[PDB]
């Protein structure tokens, strides 16, 4: 099988806006994770063809990755910050679903998730 098309990063039917919380998610939260040592598996959609994972998209039907999130933020795709936080949590949960506890990539996702929640907590009022 082919790869699925990636998640949409624009949608002409979906109202858009920019907010201070969404700007923080791009300029601080995404930027911090993108530069982390463990970012690389998460910087683009899972290419199940290149990785020889014919079952990846049989198991994971809601894919998400930080390349998509970065484009959504840059495109002002979202209406609110909780939509973007949900995309990060989908990405982490997909990794935990497909893989097993203690696997290398699961420990990498757990480190990124810990840092993610720290950066969210730091959002100034
Ligand atoms: C361990 C689970 C890891 C495979 N993994 C998974 C494998 C099986 C099943 C599930 C997963 C999984 O859940 N996720 C999130 C993955 C997503 N994307 C990828 N993509 C990549 C894989 C290899 C390379 C790849 O061949 N390379 C060359 C050397 C580079 N290194 C970067 C860091 N520096 C220090 C050394 C060179 C980068 C790594 C590059 C990749 O995407 C860019 N892999 C995932």
- What is the Cα–Cα distance from 69 to 87, expressed in whole angstroms? 7
Question: 41 C-alpha vs ligand 1 centroid, how far in Å?
Answer: 4
Report whether 68 contacts 9 (CB < 8 A).
yes
Q: What is the DSSP string of the chain?
A: -PPPPPPPS--TTS-----HHHHHIIIIIIHHHHTSTT-GGGSS---TTTTT-TTHHHH-SS---HHHHHHHHHTT--SSHHHHHHHHHHHHHHHHHHS-TT-HHHHHHHHHHHHHHHHHHT---
- What is the Cα–Cα distance from 35 to 40, expressed in whole angstroms? 9
Does residue 4 have its Cβ closer than 6 Å to ligand 1? Answer: no
- What is the Cα–Cα distance from 111 to 64, expressed in whole angstroms? 17
The Cβ of residue 64 has, within 10 Å, a number of other Cβ atoms equal to 23
Question: 56 C-alpha vs ligand 1 centroid, how far in Å?
Answer: 14
- What is the Cα–Cα distance from 111 to 119, expressed in whole angstroms? 13
- From which experimental method does this structure derive? X-ray
Does residue 112 have its Cβ closer than 6 Å to ligand 1? Answer: no
- What is the Cα–Cα distance from 105 to 19, expressed in whole angstroms? 33
Angle at 33 between CA 82 and CA 69, to 5 degrees: 45
Give the resolution to one decimal, in Å: 1.5
Question: Which residue is associated with the tokens 């935990």?
Answer: 96
Atom of ligand 1 nearest to the CA of 104: 1
- What is the Cα–Cα distance from 106 to 5, expressed in whole angstroms? 25
Domains of the chain: 19-123 (1.20.920.10)
- What is the Cα–Cα distance from 106 to 111, expressed in whole angstroms? 9
Torsion angle of alpha carbons 12, 15, 18, 23, nearest 10°? -70
Does residue 67 have its Cβ closer than 6 Å to ligand 1? Answer: no
- What is the Cα–Cα distance from 66 to 52, expressed in whole angstroms? 21
Report, in angstroms and rounded to the nearest whole number, the Rg of the chain calculated over CA atoms.
15
């Amino acid at each position: 099988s082919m790869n699925p098309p990636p998640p949409e990063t624009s949608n002409p039917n979906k109202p858009k806006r920019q907010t201070n919380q969404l700007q923080y998610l791009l300029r601080v939260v995404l930027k911090t994770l993108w530069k982390h040592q463990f970012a690389w598996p998460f910087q683009q959609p899972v290419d199940a063809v290149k990785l020889n994972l014919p079952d990846y998209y049989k198991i994971i039907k809601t894919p998400m990755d930080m390349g998509t999130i970065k484009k959504r933020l840059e495109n002002n795709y979202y209406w609110n910050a909780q939509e973007c936080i949900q995309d990060f949590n989908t990405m982490f949960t997909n990794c935990y679903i497909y893989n097993k506890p203690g696997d290398d990539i699961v420990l990498m996702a757990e480190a990124l998730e810990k840092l993610f929640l720290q950066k969210i907590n730091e959002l100034p009022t």
